[PDB]
Ligand binder design. Structure first.
Ligand code: TEP
Ligand code: TEP
Ligand code: TEP
Lengths: 108, 107
């Protein structure tokens, strides 16, 4: 458990997971339930904050770069898949700015 | 700032010289590039040239202001372009380097 991963769990995940915009990212996209049949045709590496939260919990990551990449993949999937006007894009944009801000003060 | 000098001289140099960085070294010219819808979809254009000038003339107050400009540039690319466009892959490749370099910023 590196200091950075610790920071990513205690500071970054703590901040993002409890956020009023977090709820659509707390679990993988359910393409059936959300009625997005082309989702897994366009997004080939799905990611979400539940997966990351669990991986930070089970010390799945060897580096912070890895956990950072997963956050980035989750936000990037949303910007790529969704129409520019979808509310979820601006929800992801809001979360991703918190993530960046926090990451600006991560150790090492 | 020590962090802004790291963004200038470690992160931005790595990104600037990358073989995929050429579309991002200067603002999108919607006219020359044939994209008249570009500014109706992208309301905050951003590019590494602007970020570079801004680091040179001391525009930024904090690292995170500059990291937010990098992100806006990448996010603009994902939002405007179709998922199949090569520029999407180019941006992600550049974005991962940025995330990797930022992890090692002086705290
Ligand atoms: C958990 N959650 C919320 O917190 C929320 N707020 C508004 N819609 C919401 N939906 C659809 C939801 O699932
Ligand atoms: C991440 N994500 C999306 O990318 C998306 N697109 C449409 N609904 C969506 N929902 C609810 C979602 O969670
Ligand atoms: C950033 N950017 C784009 O987002 C884009 N979309 C299509 N060509 C593009 N070019 C040349 C570009 O520089």
């Amino acid at each position: 458990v590196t200091n950075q991963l610790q920071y990513l769990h205690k500071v970054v995940m703590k901040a993002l997971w409890k956020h009023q915009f977090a709820w659509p990212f707390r679990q993988p996209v359910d393409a059936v339930k959300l009625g997005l049949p082309d989702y897994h045709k366009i997004i080939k590496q799905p990611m979400d904050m539940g997966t990351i939260k669990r991986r930070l919990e089970n010390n799945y990551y060897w580096a912070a770069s890895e956990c950072m990449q997963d956050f980035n993949t989750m936000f990037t999937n949303c910007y790529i898949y969704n129409k520019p006007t979808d509310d979820i894009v601006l929800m992801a944009q809001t979360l991703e700015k918190i993530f960046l801000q926090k990451v600006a003060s991560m150790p090492q």
